[PDB]
Amino acid sequence: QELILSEENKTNIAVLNLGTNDRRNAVLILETALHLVEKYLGKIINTSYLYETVPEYIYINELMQNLEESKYEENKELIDKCEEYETFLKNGKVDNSILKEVNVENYLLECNNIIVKNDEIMYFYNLTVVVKTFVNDPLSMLVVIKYIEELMKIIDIDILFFNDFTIFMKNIKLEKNMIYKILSKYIHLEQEIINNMVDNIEFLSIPHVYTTHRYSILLCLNDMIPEYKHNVLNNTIRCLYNKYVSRMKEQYNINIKENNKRIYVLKDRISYLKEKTNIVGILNVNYFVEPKRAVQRMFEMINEGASVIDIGGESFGNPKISERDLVVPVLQLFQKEWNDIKNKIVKCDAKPIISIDTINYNVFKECVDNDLVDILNDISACTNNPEIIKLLKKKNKFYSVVLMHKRGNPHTMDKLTNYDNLVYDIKNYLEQRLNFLVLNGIPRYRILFDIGLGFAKKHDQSIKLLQNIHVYDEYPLFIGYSRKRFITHCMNDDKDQLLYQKNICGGLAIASYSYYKKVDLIRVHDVLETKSVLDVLTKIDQVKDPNSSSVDKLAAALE
Amino acid sequence: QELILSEENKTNIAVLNLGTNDRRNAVLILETALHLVEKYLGKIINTSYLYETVPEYIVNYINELMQNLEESKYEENKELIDKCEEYETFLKNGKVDNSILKEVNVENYLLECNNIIVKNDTSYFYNLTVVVKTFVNDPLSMLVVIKYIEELMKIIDIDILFFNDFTIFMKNIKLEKNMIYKILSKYIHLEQEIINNMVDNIEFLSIPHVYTTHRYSILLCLNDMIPEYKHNVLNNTIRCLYNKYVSRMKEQYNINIKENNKRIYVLKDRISYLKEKTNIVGILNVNFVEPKRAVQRMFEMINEGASVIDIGGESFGPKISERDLVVPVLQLFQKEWNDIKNKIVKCDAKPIISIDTINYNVFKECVDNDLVDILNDISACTNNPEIIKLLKKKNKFYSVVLMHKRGNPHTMDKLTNYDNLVYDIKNYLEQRLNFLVLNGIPRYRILFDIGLGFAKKHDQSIKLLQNIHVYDEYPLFIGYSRKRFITHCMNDDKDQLLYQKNICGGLAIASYSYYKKVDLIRVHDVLETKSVLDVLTKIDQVKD
Ligand SMILES: Nc1ncnc2c1ncn2[C@@H]1O[C@H](COP(=O)(O)OP(=O)(O)OP(=O)(O)O)[C@@H](O)[C@H]1O
Ligand SMILES: Nc1nc2c(c(=O)[nH]1)N=C(CNc1ccc(S(=O)(=O)Nc3nccs3)cc1)CN2
Ligand SMILES: Nc1nc2c(c(=O)[nH]1)N=C(CNc1ccc(S(=O)(=O)Nc3nccs3)cc1)CN2
Ligand SMILES: Nc1ncnc2c1ncn2[C@@H]1O[C@H](COP(=O)(O)O)[C@@H](O)[C@H]1O
Ligand SMILES: Nc1nc2c(c(=O)[nH]1)N=C(CO)CN2
Ligand SMILES: [Ca+2]
Ligand SMILES: [Ca+2]
Ligand SMILES: [Mg+2]
Ligand SMILES: [Mg+2]
């Protein structure tokens, strides 16, 4: 089977799974795996969310710089469709398997064995990806995958699928040149590494053994490929996923979701979806500029409770100063000030996340290259310049993004009000945007949804989007209601000094609502007022003993 | 004339149903009834809530009637009572004297009721039950007097549900014109068309009332007052009867019988549906603070949205008395308002006035001078129970907030041990309500208050809020505004800063109160609180 090393380039679809148990470093570890996969295997065109997952019963920064170059070559360029991947999804006719393919009944029994053999032989942070690969075979990829593992040194990368193939290779152990040969074909090579690998490649199963048995795997695949149907499976990934969840409720009285949590990432750390309402402080430099003043306003917001600061330099209501001249210097003064540290040598938890509210590629490029920002807040949902998406992946870094719905601009917005179906048009729009970024290899868990309150919505439509916010229960949700006219509209009425108060207080009501609907991030001017509110509500929800209400009631009834 | 007009004075327990279907005058019609019951029939020792109720067929001339009522031959003793033996006898079903009217047995009663029911085959009813310790000899005499009461009011229906433990069914009652006069004269100082009109009205008498078992609005009311009660003719206790009726309505048909039969509380003279609105009570602390500035503050608050104003002259935790602070302020306001020049046509815009006092003398003056509507007693009428006597006038009833505290503002933070915090307080409030109810204060006029920050550590004030659902059946009134415990919640110019956080923390509780359907919140910052409620209300208004 020597044509494994054929230099004739193929295009292949491979679905991977990546797991670590280092919680403190999950983001860092798994985004490092991702970058290496991108570098050494092909193009990432789908990813699941990050999940904290329970088991199924019951120096990187310096090593990143010097890395063997790939023999293949990278285009960060954008794509609309993928013909190969579309074929993988429908199961369509793909070139026959290089390796020998076992049949389904033969495959099932081999996997029966491996599960039971390991059943008897007796926190996870999981992620799936889809690779468009220039690798000819799953085994060659497994050689590379395990070399990726080996250099990273903690990190487990499996191969869940390879095209439509059904494969169970029992006898595997091979030439320490054959390993050198595979790794000569794809990576531009510069000794103890291979030794550890020959031992580990005992066998190969395509699809993976625990594909249909580990919940955490179904959970990841249900994000990426809900409709996929391998010949090996009884049903589509989503149906399996549903049966698993349904069946765990009927037969064990367990909701399996409870111990397996969806994660979104803002900067470098895990955030559990729906578990915290984060405050985002508004700094509109636009509001003859005062960069010293505006940076103290930034610090004012940090001490007031904001986890995230949102900075932009355009007006939503200006003679000759540019957007860049408004935001880059303030951000630079912030980085300068913060960095002349006076408080701690352990300030890895205390730093505010910085978001830039821009649609301009050039602004965001300058920011990213000067390490000035963490999050792109793009109110066009990257529709003004999709190339901006490219600036979200550096060689090692990833950046997170807020995608927001609007129509038109502040001057034309208020008229652009007709929707076929308000709630679902806006939801469908955003999922579409997410599909695009995900196709272009923006990690799904780094993408935040924003419905764009007051942007091309009548005030009753702003209210209605809020009435139906549960529609984002599956998603990181970032909203901005602060000081907008729809809040005022709700009120049954020196006159406009009262109006400003009535508006800030009505905002605080949406803070509460947002707290109960479990919104991930809220974009507010009045950071103190909001944090106060959130603190009280968080306290009222901290129940020391969760079923004491019924106990105490019975204690009273029998006096 | 025989043993019906017998000179021996008796003490009987009677149970009454009160009904009207004028919605706007529901309170005025039914309390007129309550007064007339209290004047002519005996002593009111229990009442149900007020209910807006689905029909089960299956004008200021009334204030002029109160100025011309003939005198009762019997007395109103207003002294407080702790006990009523006849009443405990009624509930236990122990025995009173022989019935003066011929009784029938269970079999025969059931037949004759079912005879009436079968033979008997758009606006809501406003319903109320009462227990009366009565000096009337028998149900027939009592029904006669009831009819006089109904006719005087000219709109109203008063039924006898029980009368002692008697089972009576008298079929073809024929009463002579001079007999009714004689019955009426036995109880009322009579000094003409009324009595000729009554002669027909009484065709028969049934005890218990025919529809007792068969109308939901009846079991609803009785479930408040006498859940344990089991008359011989009944197949189970009031509560079980009520319960079985709720569950049966959910299987037999698919209705939640609760949804359309609503519980009502009364703040002044209007209906409030329990749990349908979170009202704002504006705090006016008058602690020499001059009447003019304060009355302006009252006006600022009404425009800012307050439904109720709560005026207090006492410190919370010199040479000026409580009366001299509060009474003048309330006198100026009564006057200033009566300049209704902006509105010669609107008078329902008037704020309800709450007096935050415990001193009998202060409230007496307020009451004598129609300066207030509600007593806000922070001791729950514990400190001087005589104050309960001032909530009834001949024609008015006043509403009362009953707050829980221990000790005084100095002793307070040390009186913090509770076996079962949530239910100790609740049961304390229930005990206190039972005590006003026994003394003839309408149950639907009593609001509950957990007393946040009064003999409560900060975590206990939080715990009480966390368990506010415990008052889902009750009219609930809370005061969190600018209390120390709000600040306890917060994580970390100093003085005004913490002050801002505390007002905003209070708006968080305003939000929580909204979702928990709290009936009244006592706040300093009215405009701010009204803004929160308005937005939350909007988000909840799913109408297209
Ligand atoms: N316990 C009772 N209370 C009141 N009325 C009674 C009672 N038992 C029998 N009756 C008779 O029933 C008659 C009907 O009462 P009324 O004229 O108020 O009409 P109603 O309200 O339809 O009756 P009900 O309240 O019995 O449904 C009374 O006039 C009275 O003669
Ligand atoms: N992710 C995200 N980013 C934002 C958001 C937002 O909601 N989400 N909002 C603004 C502020 N936009 C805004 C301000 C005021 C109104 S308004 O309706 O109250 N006033 C108007 N301005 C122009 C026409 S109407 C509407 C939108 C700026 N950046
Ligand atoms: N019905 C009703 N009437 C009231 C109420 C109330 O809650 N209900 N509260 C006050 C206000 N009293 C008060 C003010 C502040 C505190 S506190 O929270 O500051 N108490 C303290 N706790 C610890 C140290 S001081 C306590 C009570 C006055 N009248
Ligand atoms: N589909 C597959 N993907 C990845 N590794 C596989 C597969 N089938 C068998 N293996 C082998 O089995 C091992 C599984 O190890 P682990 O994931 O650490 O339990 C790997 O090291 C591989 O050599
Ligand atoms: N809900 C309700 N229904 C009734 C009532 C009443 O008081 N309440 N009274 C009736 C006879 O007057 C007939 N039907
Ligand atoms: Ca690549
Ligand atoms: Ca009396
Ligand atoms: Mg593995
Ligand atoms: Mg009647």
PDB file of N, CA, C and O in Angstrom, chain A residues 464 467 491-492 501-502 505-506 509 512-513 516 529 531-533 535-537 539-540 542 544 548-549 552-553 556, chain B residues 420 423 459 463 466-467 490-491 500-501 504-505 508-509 511-512 515 528 531-532 534-536 538-539 541 544:
ATOM      1  N   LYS A 464     -40.187  43.839  21.543  1.00  0.00           N
ATOM      2  CA  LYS A 464     -40.506  42.487  21.093  1.00  0.00           C
ATOM      3  C   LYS A 464     -39.274  41.592  20.983  1.00  0.00           C
ATOM      4  O   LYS A 464     -39.349  40.414  21.313  1.00  0.00           O
ATOM      5  N   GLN A 467     -38.819  40.578  24.532  1.00  0.00           N
ATOM      6  CA  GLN A 467     -39.856  39.582  24.860  1.00  0.00           C
ATOM      7  C   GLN A 467     -39.472  38.175  24.407  1.00  0.00           C
ATOM      8  O   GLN A 467     -39.806  37.213  25.078  1.00  0.00           O
ATOM      9  N   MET A 491     -42.493  54.769  29.007  1.00  0.00           N
ATOM     10  CA  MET A 491     -42.886  55.567  30.166  1.00  0.00           C
ATOM     11  C   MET A 491     -44.081  56.481  29.933  1.00  0.00           C
ATOM     12  O   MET A 491     -44.134  57.223  28.942  1.00  0.00           O
ATOM     13  N   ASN A 492     -45.023  56.419  30.877  1.00  0.00           N
ATOM     14  CA  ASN A 492     -46.350  57.040  30.763  1.00  0.00           C
ATOM     15  C   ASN A 492     -46.372  58.578  30.938  1.00  0.00           C
ATOM     16  O   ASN A 492     -47.119  59.119  31.769  1.00  0.00           O
ATOM     17  N   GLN A 501     -32.898  60.579  33.796  1.00  0.00           N
ATOM     18  CA  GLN A 501     -33.043  59.714  34.976  1.00  0.00           C
ATOM     19  C   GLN A 501     -34.003  58.559  34.699  1.00  0.00           C
ATOM     20  O   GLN A 501     -33.688  57.398  34.966  1.00  0.00           O
ATOM     21  N   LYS A 502     -35.176  58.897  34.174  1.00  0.00           N
ATOM     22  CA  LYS A 502     -36.192  57.920  33.864  1.00  0.00           C
ATOM     23  C   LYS A 502     -35.643  56.901  32.875  1.00  0.00           C
ATOM     24  O   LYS A 502     -36.004  55.718  32.918  1.00  0.00           O
ATOM     25  N   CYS A 505     -32.925  54.656  34.748  1.00  0.00           N
ATOM     26  CA  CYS A 505     -33.609  53.737  35.646  1.00  0.00           C
ATOM     27  C   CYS A 505     -34.364  52.635  34.901  1.00  0.00           C
ATOM     28  O   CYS A 505     -34.348  51.470  35.336  1.00  0.00           O
ATOM     29  N   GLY A 506     -34.986  52.994  33.769  1.00  0.00           N
ATOM     30  CA  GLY A 506     -35.653  52.029  32.899  1.00  0.00           C
ATOM     31  C   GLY A 506     -34.666  51.037  32.312  1.00  0.00           C
ATOM     32  O   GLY A 506     -35.007  49.875  32.052  1.00  0.00           O
ATOM     33  N   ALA A 509     -33.998  48.294  34.739  1.00  0.00           N
ATOM     34  CA  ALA A 509     -35.046  47.283  34.655  1.00  0.00           C
ATOM     35  C   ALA A 509     -34.695  46.212  33.608  1.00  0.00           C
ATOM     36  O   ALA A 509     -34.957  45.020  33.814  1.00  0.00           O
ATOM     37  N   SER A 512     -32.148  43.863  34.985  1.00  0.00           N
ATOM     38  CA  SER A 512     -32.776  42.840  35.800  1.00  0.00           C
ATOM     39  C   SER A 512     -33.343  41.737  34.934  1.00  0.00           C
ATOM     40  O   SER A 512     -32.996  40.554  35.115  1.00  0.00           O
ATOM     41  N   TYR A 513     -34.208  42.134  33.996  1.00  0.00           N
ATOM     42  CA  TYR A 513     -34.746  41.243  32.983  1.00  0.00           C
ATOM     43  C   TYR A 513     -33.622  40.444  32.325  1.00  0.00           C
ATOM     44  O   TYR A 513     -33.689  39.222  32.268  1.00  0.00           O
ATOM     45  N   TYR A 516     -32.346  37.751  34.593  1.00  0.00           N
ATOM     46  CA  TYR A 516     -33.232  36.588  34.669  1.00  0.00           C
ATOM     47  C   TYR A 516     -33.295  35.759  33.401  1.00  0.00           C
ATOM     48  O   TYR A 516     -33.389  34.531  33.477  1.00  0.00           O
ATOM     49  N   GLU A 529     -24.429  51.840  38.590  1.00  0.00           N
ATOM     50  CA  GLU A 529     -25.854  51.573  38.788  1.00  0.00           C
ATOM     51  C   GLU A 529     -26.237  50.111  38.463  1.00  0.00           C
ATOM     52  O   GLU A 529     -26.960  49.467  39.233  1.00  0.00           O
ATOM     53  N   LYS A 531     -24.036  47.261  38.039  1.00  0.00           N
ATOM     54  CA  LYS A 531     -23.320  46.372  38.972  1.00  0.00           C
ATOM     55  C   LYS A 531     -23.968  46.290  40.349  1.00  0.00           C
ATOM     56  O   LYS A 531     -24.001  45.217  40.947  1.00  0.00           O
ATOM     57  N   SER A 532     -24.463  47.426  40.845  1.00  0.00           N
ATOM     58  CA  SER A 532     -25.266  47.461  42.061  1.00  0.00           C
ATOM     59  C   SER A 532     -26.448  46.507  41.919  1.00  0.00           C
ATOM     60  O   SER A 532     -26.560  45.557  42.689  1.00  0.00           O
ATOM     61  N   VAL A 533     -27.282  46.744  40.895  1.00  0.00           N
ATOM     62  CA  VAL A 533     -28.439  45.919  40.551  1.00  0.00           C
ATOM     63  C   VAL A 533     -28.067  44.451  40.445  1.00  0.00           C
ATOM     64  O   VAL A 533     -28.699  43.604  41.077  1.00  0.00           O
ATOM     65  N   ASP A 535     -25.528  42.829  41.604  1.00  0.00           N
ATOM     66  CA  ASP A 535     -25.110  42.318  42.909  1.00  0.00           C
ATOM     67  C   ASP A 535     -26.258  41.918  43.842  1.00  0.00           C
ATOM     68  O   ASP A 535     -26.219  40.831  44.438  1.00  0.00           O
ATOM     69  N   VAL A 536     -27.260  42.787  43.961  1.00  0.00           N
ATOM     70  CA  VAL A 536     -28.460  42.476  44.731  1.00  0.00           C
ATOM     71  C   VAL A 536     -29.174  41.216  44.225  1.00  0.00           C
ATOM     72  O   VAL A 536     -29.468  40.328  45.011  1.00  0.00           O
ATOM     73  N   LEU A 537     -29.410  41.134  42.917  1.00  0.00           N
ATOM     74  CA  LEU A 537     -30.093  39.998  42.293  1.00  0.00           C
ATOM     75  C   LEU A 537     -29.337  38.673  42.416  1.00  0.00           C
ATOM     76  O   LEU A 537     -29.956  37.626  42.670  1.00  0.00           O
ATOM     77  N   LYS A 539     -27.257  38.033  44.891  1.00  0.00           N
ATOM     78  CA  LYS A 539     -27.416  37.696  46.306  1.00  0.00           C
ATOM     79  C   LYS A 539     -28.742  36.995  46.637  1.00  0.00           C
ATOM     80  O   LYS A 539     -28.747  35.956  47.293  1.00  0.00           O
ATOM     81  N   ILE A 540     -29.848  37.563  46.160  1.00  0.00           N
ATOM     82  CA  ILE A 540     -31.179  36.972  46.312  1.00  0.00           C
ATOM     83  C   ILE A 540     -31.265  35.568  45.675  1.00  0.00           C
ATOM     84  O   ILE A 540     -32.056  34.728  46.117  1.00  0.00           O
ATOM     85  N   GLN A 542     -28.556  33.421  45.574  1.00  0.00           N
ATOM     86  CA  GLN A 542     -27.680  32.505  46.291  1.00  0.00           C
ATOM     87  C   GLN A 542     -28.446  31.877  47.445  1.00  0.00           C
ATOM     88  O   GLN A 542     -28.542  32.438  48.545  1.00  0.00           O
ATOM     89  N   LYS A 544     -28.568  29.049  50.077  1.00  0.00           N
ATOM     90  CA  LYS A 544     -27.574  28.247  50.809  1.00  0.00           C
ATOM     91  C   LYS A 544     -27.903  26.747  50.723  1.00  0.00           C
ATOM     92  O   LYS A 544     -27.068  25.952  50.276  1.00  0.00           O
ATOM     93  N   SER A 548     -34.522  23.961  51.116  1.00  0.00           N
ATOM     94  CA  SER A 548     -34.840  24.360  52.482  1.00  0.00           C
ATOM     95  C   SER A 548     -36.234  24.966  52.608  1.00  0.00           C
ATOM     96  O   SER A 548     -36.818  24.927  53.692  1.00  0.00           O
ATOM     97  N   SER A 549     -36.748  25.534  51.516  1.00  0.00           N
ATOM     98  CA  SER A 549     -38.075  26.146  51.511  1.00  0.00           C
ATOM     99  C   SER A 549     -39.158  25.121  51.837  1.00  0.00           C
ATOM    100  O   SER A 549     -40.042  25.395  52.643  1.00  0.00           O
ATOM    101  N   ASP A 552     -38.401  23.725  55.666  1.00  0.00           N
ATOM    102  CA  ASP A 552     -38.874  24.714  56.646  1.00  0.00           C
ATOM    103  C   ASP A 552     -40.411  24.779  56.735  1.00  0.00           C
ATOM    104  O   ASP A 552     -40.958  24.934  57.825  1.00  0.00           O
ATOM    105  N   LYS A 553     -41.084  24.621  55.593  1.00  0.00           N
ATOM    106  CA  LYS A 553     -42.550  24.600  55.502  1.00  0.00           C
ATOM    107  C   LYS A 553     -43.180  23.434  56.251  1.00  0.00           C
ATOM    108  O   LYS A 553     -44.195  23.599  56.948  1.00  0.00           O
ATOM    109  N   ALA A 556     -42.742  23.764  60.021  1.00  0.00           N
ATOM    110  CA  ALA A 556     -43.767  24.644  60.574  1.00  0.00           C
ATOM    111  C   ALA A 556     -45.113  23.945  60.686  1.00  0.00           C
ATOM    112  O   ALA A 556     -45.809  24.107  61.684  1.00  0.00           O
TER     113      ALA A 556
ATOM    114  N   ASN B 420     -37.162  29.182  63.030  1.00  0.00           N
ATOM    115  CA  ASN B 420     -37.599  28.961  61.670  1.00  0.00           C
ATOM    116  C   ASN B 420     -38.008  30.317  61.087  1.00  0.00           C
ATOM    117  O   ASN B 420     -39.202  30.605  60.904  1.00  0.00           O
ATOM    118  N   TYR B 423     -41.057  31.072  58.615  1.00  0.00           N
ATOM    119  CA  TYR B 423     -42.389  30.687  59.104  1.00  0.00           C
ATOM    120  C   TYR B 423     -42.765  31.240  60.489  1.00  0.00           C
ATOM    121  O   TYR B 423     -43.948  31.438  60.755  1.00  0.00           O
ATOM    122  N   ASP B 459     -28.328  38.920  56.292  1.00  0.00           N
ATOM    123  CA  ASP B 459     -28.572  37.645  55.624  1.00  0.00           C
ATOM    124  C   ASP B 459     -30.003  37.143  55.829  1.00  0.00           C
ATOM    125  O   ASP B 459     -30.579  36.534  54.918  1.00  0.00           O
ATOM    126  N   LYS B 463     -32.792  36.367  53.213  1.00  0.00           N
ATOM    127  CA  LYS B 463     -33.496  35.076  53.251  1.00  0.00           C
ATOM    128  C   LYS B 463     -35.013  35.239  53.176  1.00  0.00           C
ATOM    129  O   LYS B 463     -35.672  34.488  52.457  1.00  0.00           O
ATOM    130  N   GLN B 466     -35.857  36.010  49.566  1.00  0.00           N
ATOM    131  CA  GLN B 466     -35.719  34.761  48.823  1.00  0.00           C
ATOM    132  C   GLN B 466     -36.941  33.876  48.993  1.00  0.00           C
ATOM    133  O   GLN B 466     -37.297  33.132  48.095  1.00  0.00           O
ATOM    134  N   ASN B 467     -37.590  33.973  50.146  1.00  0.00           N
ATOM    135  CA  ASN B 467     -38.755  33.149  50.440  1.00  0.00           C
ATOM    136  C   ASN B 467     -40.054  33.958  50.541  1.00  0.00           C
ATOM    137  O   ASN B 467     -40.914  33.662  51.353  1.00  0.00           O
ATOM    138  N   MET B 490     -23.521  44.351  48.150  1.00  0.00           N
ATOM    139  CA  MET B 490     -22.539  44.932  47.236  1.00  0.00           C
ATOM    140  C   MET B 490     -21.103  44.455  47.491  1.00  0.00           C
ATOM    141  O   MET B 490     -20.670  44.347  48.646  1.00  0.00           O
ATOM    142  N   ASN B 491     -20.389  44.163  46.399  1.00  0.00           N
ATOM    143  CA  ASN B 491     -18.950  43.843  46.416  1.00  0.00           C
ATOM    144  C   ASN B 491     -18.100  45.117  46.250  1.00  0.00           C
ATOM    145  O   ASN B 491     -18.615  46.165  45.827  1.00  0.00           O
ATOM    146  N   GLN B 500     -25.631  56.008  46.278  1.00  0.00           N
ATOM    147  CA  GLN B 500     -26.064  55.690  44.908  1.00  0.00           C
ATOM    148  C   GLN B 500     -26.288  54.195  44.730  1.00  0.00           C
ATOM    149  O   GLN B 500     -27.344  53.784  44.249  1.00  0.00           O
ATOM    150  N   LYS B 501     -25.298  53.400  45.133  1.00  0.00           N
ATOM    151  CA  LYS B 501     -25.364  51.940  45.075  1.00  0.00           C
ATOM    152  C   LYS B 501     -26.595  51.381  45.791  1.00  0.00           C
ATOM    153  O   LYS B 501     -27.193  50.411  45.334  1.00  0.00           O
ATOM    154  N   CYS B 504     -29.782  52.057  43.814  1.00  0.00           N
ATOM    155  CA  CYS B 504     -29.776  51.168  42.651  1.00  0.00           C
ATOM    156  C   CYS B 504     -29.965  49.706  43.035  1.00  0.00           C
ATOM    157  O   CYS B 504     -30.629  48.945  42.320  1.00  0.00           O
ATOM    158  N   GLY B 505     -29.407  49.323  44.180  1.00  0.00           N
ATOM    159  CA  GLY B 505     -29.711  48.031  44.765  1.00  0.00           C
ATOM    160  C   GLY B 505     -31.195  47.877  45.075  1.00  0.00           C
ATOM    161  O   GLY B 505     -31.746  46.783  44.957  1.00  0.00           O
ATOM    162  N   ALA B 508     -33.144  46.968  42.013  1.00  0.00           N
ATOM    163  CA  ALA B 508     -33.021  45.530  41.841  1.00  0.00           C
ATOM    164  C   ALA B 508     -34.095  44.767  42.624  1.00  0.00           C
ATOM    165  O   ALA B 508     -34.699  43.819  42.093  1.00  0.00           O
ATOM    166  N   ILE B 509     -34.350  45.190  43.864  1.00  0.00           N
ATOM    167  CA  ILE B 509     -35.437  44.613  44.662  1.00  0.00           C
ATOM    168  C   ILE B 509     -36.810  44.983  44.075  1.00  0.00           C
ATOM    169  O   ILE B 509     -37.713  44.139  44.073  1.00  0.00           O
ATOM    170  N   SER B 511     -37.398  45.261  40.937  1.00  0.00           N
ATOM    171  CA  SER B 511     -37.509  44.310  39.848  1.00  0.00           C
ATOM    172  C   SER B 511     -37.970  42.957  40.379  1.00  0.00           C
ATOM    173  O   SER B 511     -38.867  42.318  39.796  1.00  0.00           O
ATOM    174  N   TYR B 512     -37.364  42.536  41.494  1.00  0.00           N
ATOM    175  CA  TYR B 512     -37.643  41.238  42.086  1.00  0.00           C
ATOM    176  C   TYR B 512     -39.078  41.225  42.604  1.00  0.00           C
ATOM    177  O   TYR B 512     -39.809  40.257  42.392  1.00  0.00           O
ATOM    178  N   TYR B 515     -41.604  40.671  39.736  1.00  0.00           N
ATOM    179  CA  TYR B 515     -41.743  39.297  39.303  1.00  0.00           C
ATOM    180  C   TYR B 515     -42.357  38.394  40.345  1.00  0.00           C
ATOM    181  O   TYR B 515     -42.989  37.407  40.005  1.00  0.00           O
ATOM    182  N   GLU B 528     -37.811  56.938  40.145  1.00  0.00           N
ATOM    183  CA  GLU B 528     -36.883  55.861  39.801  1.00  0.00           C
ATOM    184  C   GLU B 528     -37.572  54.491  39.841  1.00  0.00           C
ATOM    185  O   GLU B 528     -37.405  53.667  38.935  1.00  0.00           O
ATOM    186  N   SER B 531     -40.150  54.102  36.993  1.00  0.00           N
ATOM    187  CA  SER B 531     -39.467  53.861  35.738  1.00  0.00           C
ATOM    188  C   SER B 531     -39.198  52.372  35.548  1.00  0.00           C
ATOM    189  O   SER B 531     -39.386  51.834  34.454  1.00  0.00           O
ATOM    190  N   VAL B 532     -38.796  51.705  36.624  1.00  0.00           N
ATOM    191  CA  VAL B 532     -38.484  50.286  36.571  1.00  0.00           C
ATOM    192  C   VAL B 532     -39.756  49.502  36.272  1.00  0.00           C
ATOM    193  O   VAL B 532     -39.800  48.731  35.307  1.00  0.00           O
ATOM    194  N   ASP B 534     -42.680  50.472  35.024  1.00  0.00           N
ATOM    195  CA  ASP B 534     -43.165  50.788  33.682  1.00  0.00           C
ATOM    196  C   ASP B 534     -42.491  49.977  32.573  1.00  0.00           C
ATOM    197  O   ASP B 534     -43.174  49.519  31.641  1.00  0.00           O
ATOM    198  N   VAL B 535     -41.169  49.801  32.673  1.00  0.00           N
ATOM    199  CA  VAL B 535     -40.425  49.061  31.652  1.00  0.00           C
ATOM    200  C   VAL B 535     -40.741  47.589  31.748  1.00  0.00           C
ATOM    201  O   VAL B 535     -40.991  46.951  30.724  1.00  0.00           O
ATOM    202  N   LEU B 536     -40.758  47.063  32.970  1.00  0.00           N
ATOM    203  CA  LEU B 536     -41.036  45.646  33.190  1.00  0.00           C
ATOM    204  C   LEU B 536     -42.438  45.289  32.721  1.00  0.00           C
ATOM    205  O   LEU B 536     -42.618  44.287  32.037  1.00  0.00           O
ATOM    206  N   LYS B 538     -44.118  46.897  30.377  1.00  0.00           N
ATOM    207  CA  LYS B 538     -44.017  46.902  28.913  1.00  0.00           C
ATOM    208  C   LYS B 538     -43.506  45.585  28.349  1.00  0.00           C
ATOM    209  O   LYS B 538     -44.129  45.012  27.457  1.00  0.00           O
ATOM    210  N   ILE B 539     -42.385  45.105  28.887  1.00  0.00           N
ATOM    211  CA  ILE B 539     -41.798  43.844  28.437  1.00  0.00           C
ATOM    212  C   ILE B 539     -42.794  42.690  28.608  1.00  0.00           C
ATOM    213  O   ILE B 539     -42.829  41.774  27.796  1.00  0.00           O
ATOM    214  N   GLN B 541     -46.141  43.087  28.480  1.00  0.00           N
ATOM    215  CA  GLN B 541     -47.359  43.341  27.734  1.00  0.00           C
ATOM    216  C   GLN B 541     -47.224  42.745  26.336  1.00  0.00           C
ATOM    217  O   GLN B 541     -46.791  43.425  25.400  1.00  0.00           O
ATOM    218  N   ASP B 544     -50.002  41.664  20.586  1.00  0.00           N
ATOM    219  CA  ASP B 544     -49.506  41.785  19.196  1.00  0.00           C
ATOM    220  C   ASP B 544     -48.070  42.321  19.096  1.00  0.00           C
ATOM    221  O   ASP B 544     -47.242  41.793  18.346  1.00  0.00           O
TER     222      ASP B 544
END
